[PDB]
Design a protein around this ligand. Sequence first.
Ligand SMILES: CC(C)CCC[C@@H](C)[C@H]1CC[C@H]2[C@@H]3CC=C4C[C@@H](O)CC[C@]4(C)[C@H]3CC[C@]12C
Ligand SMILES: CC(C)CCC[C@@H](C)[C@H]1CC[C@H]2[C@@H]3CC=C4C[C@@H](O)CC[C@]4(C)[C@H]3CC[C@]12C
Ligand SMILES: CC(C)CCC[C@@H](C)[C@H]1CC[C@H]2[C@@H]3CC=C4C[C@@H](O)CC[C@]4(C)[C@H]3CC[C@]12C
Ligand SMILES: CC(C)CCC[C@@H](C)[C@H]1CC[C@H]2[C@@H]3CC=C4C[C@@H](O)CC[C@]4(C)[C@H]3CC[C@]12C
Ligand SMILES: CC(C)CCC[C@@H](C)[C@H]1CC[C@H]2[C@@H]3CC=C4C[C@@H](O)CC[C@]4(C)[C@H]3CC[C@]12C
Ligand SMILES: CCOC(=O)C1=C(COCCN)NC(C)=C(C(=O)OC)[C@@H]1c1ccccc1Cl
Ligand SMILES: *[C@@H]1O[C@H](CO)[C@@H](O)[C@H](O)[C@H]1NC(C)=O
Ligand SMILES: [Ca+2]
Lengths: 242, 38, 858, 60
Amino acid sequence: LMFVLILLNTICLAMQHYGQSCLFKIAMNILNMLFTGLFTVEMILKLIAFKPKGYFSDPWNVFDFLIVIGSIIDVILSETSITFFRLFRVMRLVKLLSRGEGIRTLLWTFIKSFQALPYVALLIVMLFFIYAVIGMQVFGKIALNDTTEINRNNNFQTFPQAVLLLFRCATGEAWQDIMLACMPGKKCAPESETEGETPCGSSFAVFYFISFYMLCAFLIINLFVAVIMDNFDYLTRDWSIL
Amino acid sequence: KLVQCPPESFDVILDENQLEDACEHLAEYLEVYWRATH
Amino acid sequence: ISIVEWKPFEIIILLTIFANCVALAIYIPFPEDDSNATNSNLERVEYLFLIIFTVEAFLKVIAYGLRNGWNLLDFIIVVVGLFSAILEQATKFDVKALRAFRVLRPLRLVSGVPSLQVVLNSIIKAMVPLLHIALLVLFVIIIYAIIGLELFMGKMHKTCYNQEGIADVPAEDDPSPCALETGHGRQCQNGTVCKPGWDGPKHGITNFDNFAFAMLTVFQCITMEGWTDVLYWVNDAVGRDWPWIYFVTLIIIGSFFVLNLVLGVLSGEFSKEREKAKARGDFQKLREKQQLEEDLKGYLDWITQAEDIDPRWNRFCRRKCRAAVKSNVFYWLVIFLVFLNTLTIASEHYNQPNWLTEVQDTANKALLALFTAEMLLKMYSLGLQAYFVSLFNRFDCFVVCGGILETILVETKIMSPLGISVLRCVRLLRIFKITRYWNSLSNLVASLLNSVRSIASLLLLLFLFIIIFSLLGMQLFGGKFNFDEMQTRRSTFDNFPQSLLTVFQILTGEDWNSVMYDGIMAYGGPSFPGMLVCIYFIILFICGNYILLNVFLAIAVDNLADAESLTSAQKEEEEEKERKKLARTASRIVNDTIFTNLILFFILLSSISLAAEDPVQHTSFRNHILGNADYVFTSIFTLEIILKMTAYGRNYFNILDLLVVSVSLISFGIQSSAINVVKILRVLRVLRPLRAINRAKGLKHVVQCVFVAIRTIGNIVIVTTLLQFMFACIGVQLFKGKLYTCSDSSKQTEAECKGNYITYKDGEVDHPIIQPRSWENSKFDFDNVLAAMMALFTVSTFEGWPELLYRSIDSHTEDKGPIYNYRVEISIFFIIYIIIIAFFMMNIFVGFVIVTFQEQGE
Amino acid sequence: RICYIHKASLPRATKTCVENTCYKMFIRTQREYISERGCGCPTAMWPYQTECCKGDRCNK
Ligand SMILES: CC(C)CCC[C@@H](C)[C@H]1CC[C@H]2[C@@H]3CC=C4C[C@@H](O)CC[C@]4(C)[C@H]3CC[C@]12C
Ligand SMILES: CC(C)CCC[C@@H](C)[C@H]1CC[C@H]2[C@@H]3CC=C4C[C@@H](O)CC[C@]4(C)[C@H]3CC[C@]12C
Ligand SMILES: CC(C)CCC[C@@H](C)[C@H]1CC[C@H]2[C@@H]3CC=C4C[C@@H](O)CC[C@]4(C)[C@H]3CC[C@]12C
Ligand SMILES: CC(C)CCC[C@@H](C)[C@H]1CC[C@H]2[C@@H]3CC=C4C[C@@H](O)CC[C@]4(C)[C@H]3CC[C@]12C
Ligand SMILES: CC(C)CCC[C@@H](C)[C@H]1CC[C@H]2[C@@H]3CC=C4C[C@@H](O)CC[C@]4(C)[C@H]3CC[C@]12C
Ligand SMILES: CCOC(=O)C1=C(COCCN)NC(C)=C(C(=O)OC)[C@@H]1c1ccccc1Cl
Ligand SMILES: *[C@@H]1O[C@H](CO)[C@@H](O)[C@H](O)[C@H]1NC(C)=O
Ligand SMILES: [Ca+2]
């Protein structure tokens, strides 16, 4: 019954379109209030049944407890904003996912294998940090032109921005365009101080953007295969046998 | 005929698929056997 | 009638199926009910095909009274074909759009070939373990779609509209979302006003307005194609503070974790199938084949030379020939000759000096004559047929035959195929024989040639899938990508080759969202019936990527495991042979525990310090603290080394620590030319994070493991580099100096493309604009080998490769401009390069890593 | 003779030179900046381009 209630709540959340009428909005608000009341009723039923010690023993309960309390006080701040507090309703859908013995076992085993190897990812973290710092030092002064690949959204002028640029290149979005935009001969930052018309940029960009791609691909494959070999017992199980 | 029967008779056995090392196998046995009766 | 159903009737129907597949390729979908004579004939040919597949389903229907899936497909295809023909004749909803069922006929080419049916079943049966991952992906997509609905619902509908009216988007040709003065996003500024009311970034297709639209956007982001565009649009809409937490998390969870799960499940299934099929003993047949060939030439040469020792004059004719080939001097001389051939082939470039083009044509003939003479010398000294017995000797014979064929032309056109001298570089791969791992590369080639039958079957099923989806796309979007925009789309479904190229591009996943948007707008716009056509692109992408994975990972994993088992057995046999041969012939507080930590903390703080600098502002108060904070940080590490340097006199990590601290200390001074030297040793300050190694156990372990893996995979890296160099040489021959273009499309030479010319904004004849004529080269060209290696690398990364492909298709002649669709047949070069390198070599590398990790540990 | 000459890239300083052909060197994407000037019709490497002339001080 509560699985069906969660499904109904998710369906109710899934039909908040753009330009909805006032009646639709009021109905959605009152339906959300009804659902959060029902879930508070379940929570009260299971503090009694399970006592205040047995409730906060299953980790699926403390997560559930934190979800609903973020929905009770969500209504308090709604009648009179912050958008963070309405995301708790969606997070409850993971209980449906964590009910099949296959997906649960797969996710749990892979998460444990990920935890058991914390340095194979530290290698990628170190590579990203080193290349972000090098990019900040080298290409960190180029002008932000909205018609070029170095602009407000994509640049080397900050460590988070450099890391985001490297992440985008690792995904492989327009890394060749960024490399071509980092070549020498670009008018750049007016806030840095003649003969210097376009003296910044570098020919190091080719090696930078090629070596980063090779190293990132190699390290990602290394992490993937390490996790797979750590979890290989579950991947070749022969479930028919004991 | 000379395979299914036990080796026994062959004091030394040449097992090589090339002329080069086959020559060295025969020469190895003859040289050591050469020093036996001397 | 149950008599004539087993004779070559079943091959007559197979040939009928092949001619109803070479009649759906000849068809040209014309815009707006146009046609020609070839179509007028194809209608009647399809009438005949309909008659044939009707009286052949009737015989089977009235022979056995529709249970098997393939026969059910037969029946439904026939009935819908008859229904469509009858309705079309009666009307002579869309009538002509019901002909999409005719593209299912090529699917029967595997129902008549059980050898293909078995590989289709093998591919299909691997889907069941992946259904859990599919369900997880669906749940993640739903959750992120709902979150995007709650976050960015209807917040990207405002663009700059200029302070003179609301005519149309006066903010570049690519308008972007903005925000008001009370907003946090992008501000239009100057003579523009952020006015509400606007379709959207992609004609209203990419947004989180609806749940369906949000789901489509989330799927497109998860496919890792064009997700930064959505992220930047959201940044311009709501702000640049918290959309990265959404998009980066979505990319990490739905694209990397999911790919890891898919790879793990597929590898486990492949390993289980391998361990089940090893019980039969298929490896034994491959194992017994190698030794039967090793002793073959080892006994044939014994027979050959013993004839020459004699009992007509062969005593003074044969000893030198076989004693020169095996002299170890002929080997190095031939290696040097091949190196010279590579040198002269790779020295070609655009606009070369006139002496070089004569040197590299004289040397080509000289080396060709020398290699022909060597081939003829070797051809008789080791038997005419025993020379043909060897593997690489067949490659040499084919290379000589092709070179002699293409060097005598000297009168005909297109001498690009004359450069098959580049495959002579494969002959120098015997340099592996002197080194190690030669028994790991040749074993791979032996396994590939042994399994070439299954390889061809797997590559043919993928081709059938591509053909079916190309026909379906040609039916759906044929002649429909013709809108009023001034630019003409290059990735269309107008012809069969063009549809094949478009489907291949979508399979590679590059710019597939652009083709999806083109297909969506071709059926109206963002509306419920019109936008349902994106299911075609979604299914094509998912199924094609899954099939490519199941093919190119299975091939690599199976062949590499077989090669490794062969190498292990050979090593065991060599060990046993050389053992049995020998068994007879013979008969200071720096060594603390907490300190160390405290200084790996300092190390972390020092690493944090230089990440917080100001890259652009040379002088800023934040750098005042950080610049003077490194001073005290460097003192601690300076004190650490002195406190340790007395204990001993040196390992390899104390050297790194010294290289860090001494560089920092000297950088504290320098002075003088504080422009060049400082800019080198300031970037040399990136070695501080690397000091965590040798100071944090486990980091050293993983670094050493990665180094061992690099040393293991260096051979595959070298082979891939060699293939890339060869393909770069071929591309240099093909497209040298041909990828030039002028901004004015009416000028086809550098001299003509000079001065100014008139352009029109959006092709409006009433709005002319003067622009300067410029002779421009491609972003990635093939002028020389070095410029071609990088272009091929970017193609292998699937980044901007359609642009290069369509630039190369138009090129026709050196020093002249492009011609629309001149050589569409040149796309085979790019297709082959992508298949061999970007699909086979990468999966071979991944499978090699998997196998070298599996044979370690367990 | 004196068509704008150089060997390096940063200062754009002249040099001795001959021959009736003088050129410009620039990146294809960054068209509106001449990286290098000299004489002859040399071959660029990447991503540079060459535009040659016929008279003295044609490259400008
Ligand atoms: C599994 C289902 C229930 C999840 C949610 C899907 C349904 C409820 C969604 C998806 C498509 C949506 C519709 C698509 C388009 C529009 C046009 C708009 O001007 C008014 C809302 C309206 C009519 C939407 C209402 C809600 C809608 C019908
Ligand atoms: C190719 C394989 C998958 C079989 C073919 C299935 C697809 C392509 C077929 C089956 C059902 C067909 C549709 C049935 C009904 C309609 C509505 C009509 O107003 C236009 C044609 C249209 C839209 C058809 C187009 C083609 C169609 C979608
Ligand atoms: C033997 C194989 C492996 C390597 C061959 C390397 C030699 C022959 C190749 C590699 C890169 C080539 C260069 C690439 C580009 C340029 C720039 C231009 O000025 C034309 C000649 C020149 C300078 C080429 C000369 C030949 C070159 C140096
Ligand atoms: C890819 C194959 C194997 C499976 C997916 C089937 C695709 C091709 C089918 C299924 C549903 C179909 C759509 C159903 C309805 C419409 C609305 C109509 O006004 C135009 C055609 C259009 C838009 C169809 C196009 C083709 C379509 C998308
Ligand atoms: C695990 C390790 C590698 C994590 C390293 C995190 C460090 C390098 C990151 C995390 C938070 C970051 C800071 C977050 C915010 C800002 C404000 C910005 O205007 C300048 C950069 C600055 C000051 C960042 C500097 C670098 C920083 C300190
Ligand atoms: C280690 C990964 O390097 C790559 O990403 C390669 C790409 C791009 O990745 C392919 C993505 N499909 N393009 C080319 C051509 C490659 C190259 O130059 O080899 C030296 C490398 C590569 C290197 C070693 C082994 C395999 C590959 Cl495929
Ligand atoms: C950089 O931005 C300025 C700002 O308008 C613009 O004038 C200039 O043309 C841009 N640079 C290029 C190369 O277009
Ligand atoms: Ca891409």
